[PDB]
Amino acid sequence: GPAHLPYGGIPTFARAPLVQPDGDWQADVAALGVPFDIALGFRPGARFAPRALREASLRSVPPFTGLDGKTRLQGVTFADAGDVILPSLEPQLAHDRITEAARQVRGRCRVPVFLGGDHSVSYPLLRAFADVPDLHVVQLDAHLDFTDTRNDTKWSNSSPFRRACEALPNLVHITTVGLRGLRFDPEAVAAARARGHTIIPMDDVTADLAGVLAQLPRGQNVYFSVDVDGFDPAVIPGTSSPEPDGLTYAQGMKILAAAAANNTVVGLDLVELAPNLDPTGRSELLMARLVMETLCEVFDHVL
Amino acid sequence: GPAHLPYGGIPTFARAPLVQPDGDWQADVAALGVPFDIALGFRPGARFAPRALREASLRSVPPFTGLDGKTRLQGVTFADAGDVILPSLEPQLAHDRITEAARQVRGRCRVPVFLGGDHSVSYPLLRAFADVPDLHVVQLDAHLDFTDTRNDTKWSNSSPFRRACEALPNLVHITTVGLRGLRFDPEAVAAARARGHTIIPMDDVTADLAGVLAQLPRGQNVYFSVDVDGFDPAVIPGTSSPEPDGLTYAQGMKILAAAAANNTVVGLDLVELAPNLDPTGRSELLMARLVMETLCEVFDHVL
């Protein structure tokens, strides 16, 4: 039967069938959107990312046969659980709904994909992984986001991992790659190091990418958290707070690919994408491809 | 329970359930998108209209309780049959697929709603109504679109009604409102008048709206065709070929409301919306509402 072109059809992630978080379904991969962006401190727009990512994903429908002739994502079923129904304001309630939906989706698929949304969504998302022993997080980001309080709130996008670690004793380690910028929260940096978290500045990646990959976890349960601002603004300009000299698509993917080949990937979130800030549309196209390519790697090497 | 905000959830028309054109379903209203825009002669973009209209319709989910406290479209069911699976190029094939999908959708609902796409789609769309006795078309448009041949083709968006008439002996009358501009195809104008069509220049709408409403069909089977460029460019700038001094949203709606109150409406199409040409987004927001409001009027006078 004929297939739709990218501009045709209802935009669901990877053109997957639509389902309800608490519905009677099962799939290898399931996507869930979290259109929440009221926690960021600069330019809004990430609330539109889930829809933009779904639309851009229509250019990356699995499976994929590479130039080398190998096919990946063969026999991997997909489902789109829609978006968490968010209230207006009421961050605490939003968090609870996000965690609940994440729990349900996680219990019906092998690898859940969460589409943000500003980075604060990673906190309630991680709460749905409390039963994962020695849970590790591999985070691509220009920022650490391990802050306690910022602008009189505990729920900003600058505090998701700090909030997660205090709510999840099983979250034993975080590896953050791509840090750069003129300013860092000293209390957050100290608190992270105090917990043994691995901080890898973008300088480390540029100097020796092989060494960075060597610093990644091995044989661990890993949750991926990809903040699009970890990538260079020239590559992905569509984000609220860009920082120059970031990861190339290739570098970020190489890192994800490496971790995926040596660990049990329990989930992934893609946050801070701001479609409205990139009229060329390349930001959502490249990031949608990033998610799909990461899944390729995950299923091409899973235990 | 909780309801999605406009920016949340998968965008299906009016948040209706997704169905297959020839699937086992039935509803009062069914939407079908036709993301086809390679027939226009100027600025492309209408291929993205169905999707933009679905997204915009999330701000107009039925039913509607107005300022007067009365509700419209209460109990009226909706379905979104997706988009016609179009080929690349191959206009003839695209036409056949459009007619077939339109037929199947028509037989499963009371009022089908077609989202273009450039105006050329009205031709294959109308072929699905070849069985309607004394079929009348009420067309809102700045242009006549009754041209025989243009730029060496019979399938341009300037010929849909000419192609429709020579193919449908049951299409006995066309009422076109909003015509304006410096250039008009003399052959098309003569041909239209010769077939007994009613041509109402925008000047006449401005001079006396009440008079124009009296020129509309009465007690006939009517198919609505709304070219967004019939509306003033200041109101709806998102379109390929705008013409100054057009219909206000109110005037166009008054015409549709009047016609819907005195005839049996068999279908409606909304064509030529170009989301990419209006960065303010008002064009799609207003046209999604126009479709929903027209439906309110149609179901208010159902016999």
Add this chain to the structure above:
Amino acid sequence: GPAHLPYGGIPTFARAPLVQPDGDWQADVAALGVPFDIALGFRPGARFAPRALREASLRSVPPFTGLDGKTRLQGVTFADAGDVILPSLEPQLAHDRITEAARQVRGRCRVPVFLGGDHSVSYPLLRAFADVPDLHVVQLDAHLDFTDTRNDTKWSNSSPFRRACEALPNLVHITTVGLRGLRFDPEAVAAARARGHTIIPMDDVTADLAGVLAQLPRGQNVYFSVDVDGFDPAVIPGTSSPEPDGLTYAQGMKILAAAAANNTVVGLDLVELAPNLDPTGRSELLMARLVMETLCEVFDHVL
């Protein structure tokens, strides 16, 4: 001496001197910004409105000598009290800071001008007018915004006046002009009416403007709340939720001028402007002028 062009100098409202809300100063008019937009339910951007309005106001620096040769606002002093320092999230805290800043600014000027920010800011702003006997509000808006709860919160931009009335027993009446749209909260409309509020649909403005002006308050203490979406989207497209067929600039100005001529104006807010949604920049340019022209009218008939 030489004067800056609109593109030169630091942007302060009406190019007025910068002051602190609780500083030692006095002026006839004082502007205060509230860059808060996390309570709206659709498209963000109003957090940038205060800044855009300041930049745009440089095109409207007082006093003004009209075509007739007369001068308005001669000798009327201005001050820009900057913006309320808002936290991230924490709506209740934001509300408290807004009310405190408003009180301070009110106590140091004759007419305070508040630049939003989504419409939810009108609630904390009004709390600063608790000592105004029989306070009346003249509201220009496409929406009523008198809803109790919406999307599980009491602080959305759809509830500012409901929250205001319950917090301020002195707020005895609201006149809302410009209402239109397919959907209204029946409870909100009925409650407003049951409280004696005056609802004037845009249809009435169109049908008989004189009749509308006749419904405006007389000899009352009036606070002006101008929601830019009250204006037609063709005129002011830069707003989150546009509704077709709205107020022209002239009509809205006639309404404000009429009220300013017969009442004691205690303050004015300009909300819901979304600069990011109008790349032509006409929305902020026209709205900044509206504020300045409104002040011209106010000071022309002050007692």
Add this chain to the structure above:
Amino acid sequence: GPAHLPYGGIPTFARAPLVQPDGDWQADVAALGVPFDIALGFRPGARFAPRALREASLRSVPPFTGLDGKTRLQGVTFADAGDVILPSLEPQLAHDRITEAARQVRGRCRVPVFLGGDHSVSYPLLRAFADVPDLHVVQLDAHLDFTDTRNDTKWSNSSPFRRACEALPNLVHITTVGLRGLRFDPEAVAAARARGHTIIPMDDVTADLAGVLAQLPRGQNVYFSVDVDGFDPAVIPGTSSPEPDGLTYAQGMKILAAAAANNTVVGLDLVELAPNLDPTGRSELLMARLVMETLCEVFDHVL
């Protein structure tokens, strides 16, 4: 044979042949661009107007057969003399080249069309009409532009007609229609009235259009100067300094149409268009049409 679509071919005004200002040629209508915008005091962009107007004119290639079957501009020949070769800065030099080019094109056609450029170009342009006895100017503008000095210069866009009158004793009268705004130069207004110029505020057009048309010249030599900001910003947003409540396209055309039919038109300029400020592209499309329609009126009443 086959004709180019609007997006095809080299963009020359009305798709007329290209020629040199001082070349060997003759034509009824000749276009000359003046990409000069360093004299305006706000937002740049008019330097690109000539090009945008040329591109937009491809939508309006003469002749035109209206809905009445009657054809206009039949037999009228067109030519495009390109643009004046302007230096960087050096306004005095730019003016001299503008006048010289204007003189050369004037002597080679019946009706020259000048594409600005900011309004200051009207001055050196008018200097080319020194030999026209009792020259009258019909100016559509939101501003008077009869200022002596502004921001320490005599050459701004606010002084073209002031400069033109003091350099051309044959320029006996000016009728300005569409004036509006909060500020007017009292010295400029007084100076204009002193010379007996006619000032028609936009309110007069709104209150009584017939009274306006009755004030236009009859049987005079007329030069048309159309500042696009005379039109409502909702209709033509692409301009540096928009002012609310202006001329609708139809109103502006009615004025130009009346003057065109009752006088000997010796020239016309279209200034202040800023394509970069209207991403919908409707500003250039509508203004290119205005020029062509004005020409239809001019040659439709030739003696």
Add this chain to the structure above:
Amino acid sequence: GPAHLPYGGIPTFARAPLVQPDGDWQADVAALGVPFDIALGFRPGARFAPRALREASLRSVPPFTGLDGKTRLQGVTFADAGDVILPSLEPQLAHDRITEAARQVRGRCRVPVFLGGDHSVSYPLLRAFADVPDLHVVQLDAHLDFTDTRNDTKWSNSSPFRRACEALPNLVHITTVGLRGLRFDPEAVAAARARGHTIIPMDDVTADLAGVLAQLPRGQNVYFSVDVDGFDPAVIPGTSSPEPDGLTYAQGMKILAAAAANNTVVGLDLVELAPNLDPTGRSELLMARLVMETLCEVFDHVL
């Protein structure tokens, strides 16, 4: 004498004199535009590329004297034959129109430059080179475009070279550089390899550029086909289907320079530029320079 600034004058490629494809002229270089984009399967806009490239080329008017003092293209004459007059739809007719214009232009210049247009134009363009013995094509592209059928058509932008080869036995080899992405048509890859085509993935360019250059043809008749999406989207975002990690301008230019210095260049096309997808305008500016710089390289080694 005085010369136009980039925003001045009629935009012709390299500001060259305008000529007709079948006119009496002869130049070393001749540009021909093909504003055709209905064959691509995603985002349209390439029909505007020829015009955008012409305008952008005004920034690179030959000849060019570098920092070293050496001048290039000195004495090399240019001509702009306008654009192929295309019909609406009717791809077959369009193909014929294109081949004919290409034949005419090829016979009047030494090196013809074709401006696309989506990549499907390369096929009818190549048909004009049937008499070139052992024709080789050096293709810069992220995609292979050697597909047989896609979305039910043989004429999409994914099939130009497949169509060219089956119609031109003299087209004995293709070298494609820059390939990348998750998906490749296995049937197309196998068909290209069976014909002995050289496939050079972007990976090899990044791994060893020297080696890639050593793989380029030598002493052959070469036709250059530059798909802008061969370049990294960060550099050239203006294109329908971008793929991350592509050629820098420098790398792509180094490839073209090497091939131009060791072969007899018979022509070149520049396709898939989408000006509407890059509001910064760098895409057209850099791609116009690419054509001019490639020409510098070409004529520096002409025998």
Add this chain to the structure above:
Amino acid sequence: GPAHLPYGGIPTFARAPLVQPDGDWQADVAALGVPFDIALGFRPGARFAPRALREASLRSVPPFTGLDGKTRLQGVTFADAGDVILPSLEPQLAHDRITEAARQVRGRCRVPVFLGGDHSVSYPLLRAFADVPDLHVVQLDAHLDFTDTRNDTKWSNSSPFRRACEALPNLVHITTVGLRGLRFDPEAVAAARARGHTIIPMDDVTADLAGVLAQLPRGQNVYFSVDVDGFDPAVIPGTSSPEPDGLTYAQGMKILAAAAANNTVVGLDLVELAPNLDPTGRSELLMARLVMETLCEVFDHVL
């Protein structure tokens, strides 16, 4: 107490207090804007750079505590002297206005930061340093800008350093880094080499950055002139005339940091930024950070 988010408050550079150039104040660093862009020869917009840079700097408010926990700019005071009041046109008067304001600011701070404005402003800015012995200029630029005459004027942005050298014999040397492009003014290049200026093409930076840094001055009075187009267009697209393959943010900064470490920095200007040409906003965000980071470097090596 609480601090403003980036979108909050009046936008002054580094959120520093506003002062008058000749007022009674003193600060370590002082900013002065020069909103002048009528001298460039292509795309306008730089007149808005000073405002965009100030707004963007709110994301880089000092002091800065880095990842290492060390703090820079601690105790270093800032001030914003506003903008030079410029006339319309009248370049010579503007030049004088600029030089005087610059001198006044210089006498009240240690390191002045000048925000352009097209590159021509560097000339009048440098005249303010006529009292500095053996003044050296380190210029980051894609162009040499040492041209005598261009487009019949001596004041274009292509002549600033040429104008400065002939007016300031104390300016004994200029080191330009990042030069690239197809065209260079042989006259300008010769005049520069004659005076012994050091010319470093971008190729040199790419080939051996360490070698470039060894060519920078030591123990000299240095003025930094940073033209944003010296950076790669992919990184900083917001500029009038971009050139492919330029400096990465890191490279440009490495050069600035090296010169600041062993030289007495007397000032710095940031020119040619065009906010209107980069809708993603990254251009102003990155260049504002560049200015701030450069100051960190400067005050880290004060004698």
